[PDB]
């Protein structure tokens, strides 16, 4: 998933060597990583819909 994404990214660095003009390997990799890390921390900052109704 996320580990697949990054493994394929590093594979793509040496793929980007194969063809000069690469500038959208970087756009794909950067874009997927950026929003991936953001959604991952979004999921880590997830507070399920819960409230006190016992303590408070």
């Amino acid at each position: 998933a996320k580990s697949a994404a990054n493994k394929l990214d590093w594979a793509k660095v040496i793929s980007s060597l194969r063809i000069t003009g690469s500038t959208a390997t970087q756009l794909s990799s950067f874009k997927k990583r950026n929003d991936e890390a953001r959604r991952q921390l979004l999921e880590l900052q997830s507070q399920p819909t819960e409230v006190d109704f016992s303590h408070y």
């Binding site: 063809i19 003009g21 959208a24």
Partner: protein, 62 residues
């Protein structure tokens, strides 16, 4: 003595009934019901994307 007179009258005759829920409500955060997880929609439509991706890749070595 004078304190006693004041006290007797004060304690006995003066009692506050707790404030309305509205007054408390005003002095605290109100609460409102939010909506939606988020509604996004499908990405690029048609063969505009399809043609664009095949063609745009000209990032081939020169």
């Amino acid at each position: 003595n004078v304190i006693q007179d004041l006290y007797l009258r004060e304690l006995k005759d003066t009692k506050l009934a707790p404030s309305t829920l509205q007054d408390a409500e005003g002095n605290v955060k109100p609460w409102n019901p939010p909506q939606k997880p988020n509604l996004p929609e499908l990405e690029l439509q048609g063969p505009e994307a399809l043609k664009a991706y095949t063609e745009q890749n000209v990032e081939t070595a020169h």
